[PDB]
Design a protein around this nucleic acid. Sequence first.
DNA 1: GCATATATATATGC
DNA 2: GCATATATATATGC
Lengths: 396, 396
Amino acid sequence: EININNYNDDAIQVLEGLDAVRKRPGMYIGSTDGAGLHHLVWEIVDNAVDEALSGFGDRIDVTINKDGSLTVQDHGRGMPTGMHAMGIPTVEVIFTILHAGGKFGQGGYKTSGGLHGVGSSVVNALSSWLEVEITRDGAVYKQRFENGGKPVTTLKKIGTAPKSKTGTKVTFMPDATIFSTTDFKYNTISERLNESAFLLKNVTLSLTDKRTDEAIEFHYENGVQDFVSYLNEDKEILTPVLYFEGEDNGFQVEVALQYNDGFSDNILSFVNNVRTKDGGTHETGLKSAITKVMNDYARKTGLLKEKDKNLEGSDYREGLAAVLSILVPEEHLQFEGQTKDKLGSPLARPVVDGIVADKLTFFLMENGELASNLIRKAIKARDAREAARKARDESR
Amino acid sequence: EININNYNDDAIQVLEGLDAVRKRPGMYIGSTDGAGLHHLVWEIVDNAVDEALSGFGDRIDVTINKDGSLTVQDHGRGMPTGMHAMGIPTVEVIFTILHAGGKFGQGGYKTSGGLHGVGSSVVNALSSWLEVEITRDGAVYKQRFENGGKPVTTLKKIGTAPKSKTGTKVTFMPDATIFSTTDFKYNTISERLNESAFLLKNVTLSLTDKRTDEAIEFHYENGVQDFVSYLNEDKEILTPVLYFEGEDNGFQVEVALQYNDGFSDNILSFVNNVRTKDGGTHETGLKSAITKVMNDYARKTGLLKEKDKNLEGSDYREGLAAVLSILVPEEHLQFEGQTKDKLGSPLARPVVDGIVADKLTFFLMENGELASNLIRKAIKARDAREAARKARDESR
DNA sequence: GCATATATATATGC
DNA sequence: GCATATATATATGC
Ligand SMILES: Nc1ncnc2c1ncn2[C@@H]1O[C@H](COP(=O)(O)OP(=O)(O)NP(=O)(O)O)[C@@H](O)[C@H]1O
Ligand SMILES: Nc1ncnc2c1ncn2[C@@H]1O[C@H](COP(=O)(O)OP(=O)(O)NP(=O)(O)O)[C@@H](O)[C@H]1O
Ligand SMILES: [Mg+2]
Ligand SMILES: [Mg+2]
């Protein structure tokens, strides 16, 4: 037996890779609960999106099948259908080998959300079967895997097509043995695709559930502005949607703002169309140049007096709705961990802060009335915040 | 030439493992700053700690070399010195292959910090050079890597040692090309190792910084009680140090708690001697149980009434300082992410909430004067909080 | 029908 | 500059 009194060469083991991910899923998707479960879905969809963000495809069709598996069809270029430089088909590289793919700087993708090269393999490793249909250059190629991403067929030609017809169609059963639930939730996927559809002013995403025949479809002519509105729908707005966009040593930033009656700060941020829910170097940029440009503004118009300290950030965000969406080139792309919740690209902080800072300073100079009322609300906020502290402190 | 318009099988690159941690350092230590740099220390210490937790090593010393490299010596069993079955020294397999080790429950280890099979390998990949030295079985073996972990010797026997003596000595220089800083910080390391000491009664930990001639040692006999006591040192207490402890399903919970005249809570938790700075299922059951037990004591003794609302867990934790250290078995260990920052194992919410609730019940039932000052403390809390709500609301 | 989680929303302090 | 907890709503499983 292996011991403890007996730690020899025999005791160190090497996982075959997809096996590493079956053993330590937590490292790759976070958790094996339903939140875990849906990260598989996001991995495949992010792949169709990265195709669309490079220019290929105007339609992604997610589909919960009767039997419980899920499908992502796109009209992008297709996965390469030949022999890879390593003696199994390239598709087989995508799905079974880790740290492999097109987004390492080579030039196959423009800006793009994937960057680790694990996504499709992680989905593959964690499924009890998985199928690919590629459409390329007149032909349709299929291949299947079973029992933790194990090839059971080579890539294999099964049909012809119109020649203009291209794209990828993945379908996987998540593994009952890995996940405490394998019940895909139509409500979760609907809300995700909707989030994504905002971010492709030119794309249509769809979800179809053959379990219930429910179906929805998303499309948005004005993108991040439509996003902000959709955050303030059944709410009551105290400003028109501000829309600021710009570029800067290859960064591309798009931002939409609109205040509401409310008191919440509610601001959503995205690197290369990938929601970064914990914020990051980009969100900090925005937060910054609001507080700077508002405080600077109110000092220049005397509405915060001279001997009067500077409002705080909380104040200026109280009631805010903001969608921030940056494209960051691959050479500058850093997130904080195999996930993609937080953004560590130190360049994004001056990028955004810079671009925002200019656009905003110039919006207020133009709408004096709107901008004064924004500074008066901010003043009212620090008044409330201070009254709470006054109180909480009196009581001790 | 590889572009958007020419994407066939050469646009997919396969990164050799250690190159991947160099390509995407965020996925692997989350940042390439002072915080990332100090991650490379903690991985090598946790490896040493893991030996002591299985019973091997009474000592762990850490040195910041004049040249700015850092050593970590342990007297544990030493890494296996022979030939791994994949055809290379086992030492090599540790420092150069990802997803490899003795902690996937094979028996080499009891319960350990580590579990991913990557830490040693990450430190090597991010180092201008790395040197191991194993003492086992009468011999001192030694092996050197350069240029992000490519081996420049093999595992070479370099001399003699006495036949019962054992240990591993890991020296590495962080790679200045990767990190924005490679100054190791003595205060930082001091602090971490202090804390690693409170959980290792059988180990004395050392830090020497040959840059400046300063050293500290660390040894504790009392675990989380010595830890809580130090957490409160220059504060004023208002309670003895409380210590619960219990076992369940092979898990082991230990926790120390103690209150101060302050308004802050100070909960520190640990899985397998590894610090979980974001909590996780085990901190949460810790907190759950404090709250539920204390409101039950509230209503049973009548300091809360029918008409009154249950107190928030926030109220009960003001001035709280606590250290929760659990031991969780490999076959249940699971973090959210590669990062070990928060625990994700489901069975630990019940276990810790079981052990503490039972134990803390028993204690209030029997320390009623104190139990009532506590409850009264949470109330005057709640009245501060609920004073701030009204005095804020009364401002809008 | 009971308690389960789930979608959402505010709350400062170190 | 940084971490969610829950408050209480509703929807759904034991
Ligand atoms: N739908 C698709 N269409 C075309 N190519 C694809 C598609 N999905 C994956 N690929 C290719 O397969 C590679 C592997 O992607 P993937 O396994 O998800 O990792 P990745 O996109 O690079 N980066 P990450 O998603 O951060 O893991 C990609 O880089 C693409 O070249
Ligand atoms: N100080 C040491 N003494 C003895 N064996 C060691 C030591 N350091 C590492 N090892 C061996 O190397 C293996 C892998 O080290 P490491 O790569 O950091 O992996 P891990 O500790 O298993 N997993 P992880 O640390 O989760 O990032 C361990 O399982 C041990 O067998
Ligand atoms: Mg991807
Ligand atoms: Mg380790």
